[PDB]
Design a protein around this ligand. Sequence first.
Ligand SMILES: NC(=O)CNc1ccccc1
Lengths: 237, 300
Amino acid sequence: GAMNSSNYAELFNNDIKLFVDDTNVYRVTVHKTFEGNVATKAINGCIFTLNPKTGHLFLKIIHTSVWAGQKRLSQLAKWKTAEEVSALVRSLPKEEQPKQIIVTRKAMLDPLEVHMLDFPNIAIRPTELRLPFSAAMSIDKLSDVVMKATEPQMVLFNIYDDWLDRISSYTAFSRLTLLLRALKTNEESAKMILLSDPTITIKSYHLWPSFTDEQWITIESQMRDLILTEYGRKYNV
Amino acid sequence: MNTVPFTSAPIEVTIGIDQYSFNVKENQPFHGIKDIPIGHVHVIHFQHADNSSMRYGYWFDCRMGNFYIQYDPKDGLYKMMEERDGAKFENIVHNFKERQMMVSYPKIDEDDTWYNLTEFVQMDKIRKIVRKDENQFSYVDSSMTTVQENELSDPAHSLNYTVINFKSREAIRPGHEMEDFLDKSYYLNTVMLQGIFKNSSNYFGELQFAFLNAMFFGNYGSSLQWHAMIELICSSATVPKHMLDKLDEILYYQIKTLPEQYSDILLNERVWNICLYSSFQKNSLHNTEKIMENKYPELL
Ligand SMILES: NC(=O)CNc1ccccc1
């Protein structure tokens, strides 16, 4: 069944699951040709595969060479995504393989279902949620590793930094989705909020600044203000 | 020309013989059907006046024996049986034919409808889908479910059609996932035609049998099978040219013969719009497309 507000808490139970987002797999700049036609040039992308309970992020970098000489790239991207996700499952020890995989876009259901035929006990689910995972390329260290890659590469991150030492995975996921939603609705302002204070740094082994509990409350507040506003600035309210 | 004689008609019933049908009143002096064309399978089917629930009927070929119908008042249906005494049967049919107590299979000479709907249907294949080996004829009814249906409950009463499942290992070669899911030619030509059906005639035979069970009995799994076999061909980029041409003729007559007031349930919108307008073979079914557009433009 689909994942929605009603069954939100299932994400943080003890059944291994993964979110799969394919939004940033196939990325193009569109440009004009000398003849005045339009062409696309691909840039590196990534598959965003996340354990919402542990914060473990399997960032599969999609090097532009994988598109070379291929047709219908938007459709291939979904299949490529499905192949990498299934290769990932297969590489994990049995006790680490997900019992569920949740795709953020329904067009991934059939490609993933076909690639996972060897795993009939892994439920492939869509969601009704409008999750902001596309904004993961707004996270500087993730964007940096993607853009610098010269070959296919898998990079492993904990998208929650050390937060699970102090908060539950429900709150960590809620923080993450709040940050990513802010970065998606107004990336400049979201980044201004995260770095306004020169004294709060990002540890070399982290993605997000080292905020105290009190500072995270202020920060989270500032991100909610931004999201409400930009909704206003958009809808004039 | 052969004969399906009846012992009597004790309950009011609409009797169907192939694509024809006629009403028999309770205890009317009706003793059966004569002049049945040799060389084709046939189906004789029933819908009781009292309980329109359960259309049921018998597939049979008169070359395979002498068959008659007798109402069973315990099981409450018209049962087909084989008269194993050739003399008793010839005499009885003659007696009936003399008293003119039989309706004539009402075939117009210009009319090739039945041949065209049963071109590739063979009684021997029917008997492997409908497993009841002690009889030469095969019972079907509205409620029988398919093997594939039961997988997703009484095995002896199933329709053992060939299982087609687009999201299965059988359909999908490891390492050809996208290729095989978007272009089913592998699954059609190697797995099914060469592997399971052996030739296109056996494939078309089952397809035509599925349709006929769907139309005559409203059998839902039969309709599912019909559409699946159509969709496997239409979604294959590589089909022998002879199969496409024959498919267009096949489907044309199925659509021509469908009762107009049953198209809403028997025809799957998704399959037909995909097949006629999106699929590899979108251009290869000119007759079927033209009849479908002039007769059911709503569905599309
Ligand atoms: N009379 C019998 O016992 C067999 N019944 C029968 C009736 C019609 C035609 C052929 C046979």
